[PDB]
Amino acid sequence: VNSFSGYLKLTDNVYIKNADIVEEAKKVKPTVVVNAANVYLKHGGGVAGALNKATNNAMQVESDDYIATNGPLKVGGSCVLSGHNLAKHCLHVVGPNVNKGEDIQLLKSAYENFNQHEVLLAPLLSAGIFGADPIHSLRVCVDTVRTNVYLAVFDKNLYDKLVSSFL
Numbered sequence: 001v002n003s004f005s006g007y008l009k010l011t012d013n014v015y016i017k018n019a020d021i022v023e024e025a026k027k028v029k030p031t032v033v034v035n036a037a038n039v040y041l042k043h044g045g046g047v048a049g050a051l052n053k054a055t056n057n058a059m060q061v062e063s064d065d066y067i068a069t070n071g072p073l074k075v076g077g078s079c080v081l082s083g084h085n086l087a088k089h090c091l092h093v094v095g096p097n098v099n100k101g102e103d104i105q106l107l108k109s110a111y112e113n114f115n116q117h118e119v120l121l122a123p124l125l126s127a128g129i130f131g132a133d134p135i136h137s138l139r140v141c142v143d144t145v146r147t148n149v150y151l152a153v154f155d156k157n158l159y160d161k162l163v164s165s166f167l
């Protein structure tokens, strides 16, 4: 039993809810919140910009030190950093950005990072400003993640389409 409430169950291990991942994180305080990161951990917009703003820029400060030490992530890769006031940890995961020409096949690799964590609160990878089809992102999620994932979809119209079209 966990504290996530109001989700629609899609599969044994994948759940979905129309919610702002920021407000969901502040309420649940999950062990892991997933950020839709880029390779530079520049949290300027989208989910990343929203999560970072909610940390009063502490996420960005921590991320800049991480990059200065370690260099950029790989597309499809991840790193674990602090969750600040939102969660114990933040798993920064880089899905391919279609508006940069990156191989959509890397979306499966991106979701594989979730399997290193028993429970996660997460967005749909490569959706929104990353340019991929969110219906496709959801399919890859369900077919790749085996741990328990609670998906927050900010757009209500997108949420209803994802549910109604799910096979």
Ligand SMILES: Cc1cccc([C@@H](CC(=O)O)NC(=O)c2ncnc3[nH]ccc23)c1
Binding pocket: 019, 020, 021, 022, 023, 036, 045, 046, 047, 050, 051, 123, 124, 125, 126, 127, 128, 129, 130, 152, 153, 154, 155, 158
């Ligand atoms: C990868 C990527 C980039 C850009 C945009 C999105 C969309 C996709 C959608 O609508 O779910 N989601 C969000 O931006 C989002 N999701 C949950 N909680 C949130 N809080 C504030 C914003 C926000 C996704």
